[PDB]
Amino acid sequence: AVTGQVDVKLNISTGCTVGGSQTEGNMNKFGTLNFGKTSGTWNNVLTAEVASAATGGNISVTCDGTDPVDFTVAIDGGERTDRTLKNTASADVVAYNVYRDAARTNLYVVNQPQQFTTVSGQATAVPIFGAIAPNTGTPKAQGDYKDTLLVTVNF
Amino acid sequence: AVTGQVDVKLNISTGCTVGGSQTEGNMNKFGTLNFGKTSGTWNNVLTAEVASAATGGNISVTCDGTDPVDFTVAIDGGERTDRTLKNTASADVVAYNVYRDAARTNLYVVNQPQQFTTVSGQATAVPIFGAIAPNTGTPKAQGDYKDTLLVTVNF
Amino acid sequence: GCTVGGSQTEGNMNKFGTLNFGKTSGTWNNVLTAEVASAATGGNISVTCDGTDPVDFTVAIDGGERTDRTLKNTASADVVAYNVYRDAARTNLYVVNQPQQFTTVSGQATAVPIFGAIAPNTGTPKAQGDYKDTLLVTVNF
Amino acid sequence: AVTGQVDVKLNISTGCTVGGSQTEGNMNKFGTLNFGKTSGTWNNVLTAEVASAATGGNISVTCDGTDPVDFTVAIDGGERTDRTLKNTASADVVAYNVYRDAARTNLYVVNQPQQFTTVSGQATAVPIFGAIAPNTGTPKAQGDYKDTLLVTVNF
Amino acid sequence: AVTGQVDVKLNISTGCTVGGSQTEGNMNKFGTLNFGKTSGTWNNVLTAEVASAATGGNISVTCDGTDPVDFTVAIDGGERTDRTLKNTASADVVAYNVYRDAARTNLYVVNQPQQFTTVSGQATAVPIFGAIAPNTGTPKAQGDYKDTLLVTVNF
Amino acid sequence: AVTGQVDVKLNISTGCTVGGSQTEGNMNKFGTLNFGKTSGTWNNVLTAEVASAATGGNISVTCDGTDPVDFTVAIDGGERTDRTLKNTASADVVAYNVYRDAARTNLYVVNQPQQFTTVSGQATAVPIFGAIAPNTGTPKAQGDYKDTLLVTVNF
Amino acid sequence: AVTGQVDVKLNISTGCTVGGSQTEGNMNKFGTLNFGKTSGTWNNVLTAEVASAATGGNISVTCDGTDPVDFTVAIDGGERTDRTLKNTASADVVAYNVYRDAARTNLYVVNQPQQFTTVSGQATAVPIFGAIAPNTGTPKAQGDYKDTLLVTVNF
Amino acid sequence: AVTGQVDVKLNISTGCTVGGSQTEGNMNKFGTLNFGKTSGTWNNVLTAEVASAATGGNISVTCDGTDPVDFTVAIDGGERTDRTLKNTASADVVAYNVYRDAARTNLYVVNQPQQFTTVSGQATAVPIFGAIAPNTGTPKAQGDYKDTLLVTVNF
Amino acid sequence: AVTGQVDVKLNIST
Hints:
Nine copies of one chain form a homononamer.
Chain A: E1 2-12, E2 16-19, E3 22-24, E4 27-38, E5 50-52, E6 59-63, E7 69-75, E8 84-87, E9 93-95, E10 97-99, E11 114-118, E12 123-126, E13 129-131, E14 143-154
Antiparallel strand pairs in A: 2-6, 3-4, 4-5, 6-12, 7-11, 7-14, 8-9, 8-14, 10-13
Protein name (chains A, B, D, E, F, G, H): Spore coat protein U/FanG domain-containing protein
Organism (chains A, B, D, E, F, G, H): Acinetobacter baumannii
InterPro entries (chains A, B, D, E, F, G, H): Spore_coat_component, Spore_coat_U/FanG
């Protein structure tokens, strides 16, 4: 019998809120990274942007205050922690990655706070640009591949 | 004068130990559930994970032996027994809950042994995922809200 | 007078409960901690008073069989030092032979939290077996 | 701490692929819209066609299957979202537009899926015809003007 | 979803301009190759010169600078890519060709940069001499035959 | 890159044709204006008539129809645009002119449509009467002098 | 639009010249065939010789060189092509003919090169002997009858 | 190629006609100057008068009108232009002359208009009196000597 | 202008 304590805390004062999300039960549904349909072996880098579940556009984070707040954005490694989509039925995997800039260069490194700025009376967009490498080796099995990345807007 | 007996017992043989805790005086400090800063009325479900007081990551329970032991995890209802954080100065309360899975579905029911597995030469993590409902009604007073959940790793 | 609930009469001595720390290895790094379980119901000892005005009753726990709060192995002579506290944070200690004060109102039963706590033994591994002690809790007025 | 979910998806079954592109790092380089050299004030509409980065000719999109698939083509508004080329050093801008037909009539409207057809065993070309209005007012500063239009072949 | 990049460029420094054109909407109308009226079967080679839409004479290309610039001229294959005029109503076709010299010898080969010279303070003419072979076989249907050759003055 | 359009047209309905010509490659060879042999300094006006390349006589233009059509005849200024024959080897020039009537009065003015009539079931002749002024000044160098006048029968 | 070519030529080397002519504007006036005055009905063959416009005597053709050159002489059929003089006002005609020898035997056949010889340092005369048949039938109307024969000295 | 003009003229109004002639083909045969037979060396001047070919007498010129017209008579120098009769076979010549008066005094000078008068309703005779000098030197060869003098009645 | 011919003859023999 090892009984222990867990201090719970919350500082209600002046915070920042994330728009574009829908409450899926008790977990914020931020959006979808829909690469679309594809064949077994694709030569072109499959690339799609996150579509917020609430509006359809990009996640719009706004802060509540007058001075420009600096908030951070961190995305995790997905269900299996290595950014791989898994086929619903078979065990095939599809490696992918999420970048921050339009040219697929600034990668959202696993469990890292990619910095962001936000001014009063304005909503800043969180570009989560997906990208998949060209698979010109083995044709992955037919079906639907999925993953649930947890995006962590933290301060 | 009602004098009575209390039998004390301890079976020293082959037990299981919880890592990630720090001994706060004579009580094991397991960690912190830090939701962060927030405004009076938040529309998004505030959500944070427990951070072990010893390492900063998740509580890592390991057992001492060779066969996989099945240990249980039970969390209580907090200081007031209804999972509410209380403002340090005023009497305002903030209802919350702790879940076990990443999607806020498998709730750690009050005083219930949520089952867990553990194999030899490995440490299993105890995910205590916090979650707070969207308060879009009354703005709670400014300040710091706290609670001390007692996590009970028992066999 | 005032009466103590949650006890079972073991012969001619009131069995109040059990302080079960559970199973453990020779050397434990975490403070072993468990709460008293009343022998009658399984929960906490529920003391209720018989009357209309709120009575102030006291609770005193002794030092165990050997008077130094040590559990003894049933076979060998190894000992395991422990202590019983009153509050959930292991701070307010039930000092040996001391009347820790308590309140009780009419039409209500007050619980007597006897929170056990054992220090982290990271030195010598105590021998295998069962360690026991019989603390005598003294509800007096 | 606002943690949220982003569902990632990919339907590997029977897709369409775009030829004529080169993988620039992790972003598909489709081509170049080279208007050529020009003076400060040009009276003639400057006009050039996209040159695929892989072959030099037009982007050749082919689909993978037997039934004629209807795929769409969408081009965005450029780096600044208003189809303006910017001088590498100064802040001068050069407004332009991309059309689909040879007579500069069917405009690729910003973020719009201009429809397209494709049959089996054939590659369809994606004509991205550039066009710049006659500037007979102010002479833009000397140097190189650039823009990066993101072409979005989607299904 | 195959998203890709198209680099747009323009070098504003010292260019060459084409005179004799009129801006038809957003496409430069260079001129007309009017062979005139004819009967079903003509024995003489029908021959006419381009008439600039702006002045009525020959396209006058002038360069903007002091050193003699060498610019090129390229004409494409017409609407159907085989230099055939099509009847507005029926599907009859009339094969033709455009030459550069007055004796119908130096042909403007399809998609080829026929070289040209230009000196400062002077406008050079672009002779686009049309020529049609003698049709002494089948009488083409009555009506108007048309084609739109795209002339490409490039550097 | 200045890309432009050139509308090509042909009205196949009821036209007029020119006889007496031979197709030299893709250019209609109408005839020859042979002044003959001459000495360095000639006192008499050298004068000869055009000899059609097909028959040897005068160019016979006939129209295809029943109503009398009014067609025009235009002759240009020769290779150098000033009606001068050039010696094949040296740079000496011999000024000349082409008239329409037998008395060398009605001159075929440069780039001008000298009017003509034509009735059904008849061929009208196009008299191109050459004439050279008496050179009694400087003796032009020995050799052959040539020029290629482009006759333009247009409607 | 039937555009065609007319090759112009002149061989300046060693030619032959015709004397006795005057340049009437741009046409060589060779002479006059003056039959004189006559009545409505003449019984005698009216006969006169050509009188050169320059001297009054016979046309004197001389060649420029040392070897005897053989040059030809050709006379056409007059204004109406049937050797008829026309009254200036009325439509009456007077048929005539031009002979080469003094006895009216060797006729200058229409468009025919009647041969001639010429030696160095000498001028040969071109006898154009006119002759009119005796009209003893109908009296032609009063007035002046004219014609313009084109004499063609060619080599 | 020296092409030239010869104006032909005839004034049909009120003329004069010559009688006594016969049309030899297309040339008026006026008469014969028959000296008769003679020996190699004649001492007497051989003398004979012209005998008209039509009647046998003298040429009778009559004018057509009412006022007395003054017409002229001109005789040329014969075939060789020096008034010599030539033997048909050999090259011997016989010099002669034609006079106008009966006493061999008024000579018809070569190419000269010897004047004559003529009144209405009367025919005037043209005396062409021949005369040959006494040859008392060399005897000319046997045979027939001939000449054809062209008499020119002109106005 | 009425131009005409006059044949001239002489028979030198006896």
